Design a protein around this ligand. Structure first.
Ligand SMILES: CCO/N=C\c1ccc(OCC[C@@H](C)CCn2ccn(-c3ccncc3)c2=O)cc1
Lengths: 116, 260, 235, 260
């Protein structure tokens, strides 16, 4: 969260394992694994999304049988902002991988192109 | 001699005991891996969900030709085991199919209890593998068989349902070869009850249960019931299923599939 | 006892390798007919009947794979000019890799996808594939669906699925093309991929299919009389 | 310093950590009786039901006067803990009330978080103890308070609802004496979060939860929020409840109480 020093708030980020409907609001999203992330004390969350899968290895294509899950972020509270402070705060987004990470079956990719 | 069969809280004893055939000779157990990376404990309702769930009663007649269920389809309507299946992502379970059918010393007729792992079924129309989800899962009332094959020709209103033939068993095999599955034959001459213990068999170690069905219980009348002189006669057949060593993992929001 | 049972073990029961497919390949200009400049083949076992009924005794199985390519060719004109030797490129493609769309695309450069440049006239090529099942076994006869149409969906055409299909694209495709250029004459060639299993370990036997198959599923349409006629008390 | 508060699967950490007050100095535990006559094991979903359930968000204003919930009323609508409460006969549970309320450095105002065991309430009409079941349990949205006492005079249409007064706290005691309960004071000057751990307190060892309510969470504004110059301002207050060491016993059929 790259906002001001004075503005605070609480943001809830959740995970939903697949096989259900997509989560839309806070009432049906807090059931899964979630982190009540704060803004006052620290300014960086950490969400170790676990490895809950029926198969051992999932695929890397959009296939409906082996689906990852869902990720949703909700306002826990309204962003309390004192006066004489901008109203449009901003938030970035990162990704990583822990030490239990592995792939197999090397192949070639699709993002590059050559029309010649 | 009399079996005192108690799993969990309920109890089925008997006035006369016959047999107990374990499928493939391996009793159901938990996950026993000392070098497993998740050593934290999932939810194992091992003494709080083992009630003997009893399905609906079907009336077996003379010209009726068979019944078939799916597991774990036949528990989604009732029982707290149904609530521990919609909320969680995946699980594993071992079943105790206990089919009883009592009648007098003067009846006759032979039944057959089956347990087919990965029991597929055939369609009816010329559209291949084209079957909706509501007809794919009969739930607790179960489907039936048919004597001869009668496909669909209407191209405007799609039926999208199964139509298996009894001596083809739905899959496409002969009936006389079906005894290589784990089975038990209710011969009405001697005994009236039967039971089968099923372990968890799947390619994975653990799987979802909404989009998958492990076992399919097929009941086939090997010889039709004839009474002394009449031509219409109704005795019931009642099937009881209980989970054993069941466990789940991965909570999510509630998922309610439609059933038309 | 002196009866060697080892002739009919599981490694010897699948020891004979059979045919799985036949793939065409041609070499001419792209006309208004079917452009057979290259042909793709969906990788499956259930395209013949010698091997499908031989594998579908068994519910769950895991086994390593060995392929074999056989290449023959012909002509289309009587007193044709004597053409040269040819080079066929069998290129394997996993799922997610880009599908080639013409004779010479950038995806034919085999940037990382493993392929075999084959020379016509020499011995048949003979490659081996280890176990590529993502679960602990391959799954003959999957039951359920891939997707479940929920109650609060948009409509019924989105949540619909296909009965008994674990994956939309099962285990990738093959791709075969001629390396040489187009010619005024054309050489029709056929490719017969063979397949031999090894290291086979199976589980949970089931009775074999007897009425003939009808498509990739488990259903049936025709020839519903599997047994013949024979008198009861007569030998 | 920063609290890493993880019970079960979900996790509430913080940017700034303040306190954790255990009610009555005893951490929640199981049934520890070596000479107990039932030594068989009930259903203990101890690592499969400890999600941080979050109630609905109320908008705290200037002239708003308070909120109150009941436990285990506030979990009957949602969560699989709600399904393990209707089916079983009786249970026991320990709660983690975690009330957070964040605002800037320029606000003011003081809150008060309470936890009253056996929190009774007063009626409104002259008919004594005459209150229906729908108004007896607000569920997840929670009830409110009122500034002055305004009873009912209509004898034709019975209201049959509560009407507590805030500085009488519903029971009939002064507000200044309410701090002998376990409590925690959200002072908006320093900290923004608060938490209370509640053990199971009842006359029995174990009790039903449909017809009984152990804890009642009362939130009282000790000083009203004033901003710099304006007169209408809305900050939220969000309450989180999670069960700990919960267990149930005695399955029965499903019981659905009406809620008008
Ligand atoms: C280096 C380049 O060329 N080589 C070859 C290559 C070929 C095939 C490869 O993958 C293997 C395939 C195979 C294991 C197939 C089989 N199999 C066994 C069951 N099923 C399957 C399952 C469900 N639906 C359809 C069939 C199925 O597809 C990999 C590499």
């Amino acid at each position: 969260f790259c906002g001001s020093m004075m503005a605070t708030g609480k943001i809830l980020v959740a995970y939903a394992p697949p096989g259900a409907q997509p989560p839309t609001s806070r009432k049906e999203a807090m059931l899964g694994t979630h982190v009540i992330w704060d803004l006052g004390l620290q300014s960086s969350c950490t969400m170790v999304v676990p490895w809950i899968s029926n198969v051992t290895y999932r695929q890397t294509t959009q296939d409906s049988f082996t689906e990852g899950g869902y990720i949703s972020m909700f306002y826990q509270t309204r962003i309390v902002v004192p006066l004489s402070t901008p109203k449009s705060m901003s938030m970035l987004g990162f990704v990583s991988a822990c030490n239990d990470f592995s792939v197999r079956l090397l192949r070639d990719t699709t993002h590059i192109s050559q029309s010649a | 001699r009399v079996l005192q069969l108690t799993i969990g809280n309920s109890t089925i004893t008997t006035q006369e005991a016959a047999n107990s055939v374990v499928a493939y000779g391996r009793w159901p157990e938990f996950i026993r891996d000392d070098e497993a990376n998740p050593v934290d404990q999932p939810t194992e309702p091992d003494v709080a969900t083992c009630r003997f769930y009893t399905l609906d009663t079907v009336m077996w007649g003379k010209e009726s030709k068979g019944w078939w269920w799916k597991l774990p389809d036949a528990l989604r309507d009732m029982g707290l085991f149904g609530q521990n299946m919609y909320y969680h992502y995946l699980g594993r379970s071992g079943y105790t199919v206990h089919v009883q059918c009592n009648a007098s010393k003067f009846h006759q007729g032979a039944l057959g209890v089956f347990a087919i792992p990965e029991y597929c079924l055939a369609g009816d129309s010329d559209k291949q593998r084209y079957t909706s989800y509501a007809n794919a899962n009969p739930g607790e009332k179960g489907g039936k068989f048919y004597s001869q094959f009668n496909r669909d020709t209407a191209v405007t209103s799609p039926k999208r349902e199964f139509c298996p033939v009894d001596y083809l068993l739905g899959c496409g095999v002969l009936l006389g070869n079906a005894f290589v599955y784990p089975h038990q034959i209710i011969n009405l001459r001697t005994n009236n009850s039967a039971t089968i213990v099923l372990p968890y068999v799947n390619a994975m170690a653990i799987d979802s249960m909404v989009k998958h069905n492990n076992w399919g219980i097929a009941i086939l009348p090997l010889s039709p019931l004839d009474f002394a002189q009449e031509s219409s006669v109704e005795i019931p057949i009642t099937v009881t299923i209980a989970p054993m060593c069941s466990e789940f993992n991965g909570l999510r929001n509630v998922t309610a599939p439609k059933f038309q | 006892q002196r009866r060697s049972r080892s002739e009919s073990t599981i490694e010897s029961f699948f020891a004979r390798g059979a045919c799985v497919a036949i793939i065409e390949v041609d070499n001419e200009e792209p006309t208004t007919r079917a452009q057979k400049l290259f042909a793709m083949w969906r990788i499956t076992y259930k395209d013949t009947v010698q091997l499908r009924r031989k594998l579908e005794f068994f519910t769950y199985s895991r086994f390593d794979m060995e392929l074999t390519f056989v290449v023959t060719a012909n002509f289309t004109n009587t007193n044709n000019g004597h053409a040269l030797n040819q080079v066929y490129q069998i290129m394997y493609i996993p799922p997610g890799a880009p599908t080639p769309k013409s004779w010479d695309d950038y995806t034919w450069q085999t940037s990382s996808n493993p392929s075999i440049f084959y020379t016509y006239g020499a011995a048949p090529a003979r490659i081996s594939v280890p176990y590529v099942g993502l679960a602990n076994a391959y799954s003959h006869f999957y039951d359920g669906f891939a997707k479940v149409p929920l109650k609060t969906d948009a409509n019924d055409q989105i949540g619909d699925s296909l009965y008994s299909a674990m994956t939309v694209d099962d285990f990738g495709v093959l791709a075969i093309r001629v390396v040489n250029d187009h010619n005024p004459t054309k050489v029709t060639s056929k490719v017969r991929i063979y397949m031999k299993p090894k290291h086979v370990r199976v589980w949970c036997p089931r009775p074999p299919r007897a009425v003939p198959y009808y498509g990739p599923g488990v259903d049936y349409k025709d020839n519903l009389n599997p047994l013949s006629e024979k008198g009861l008390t007569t030998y």
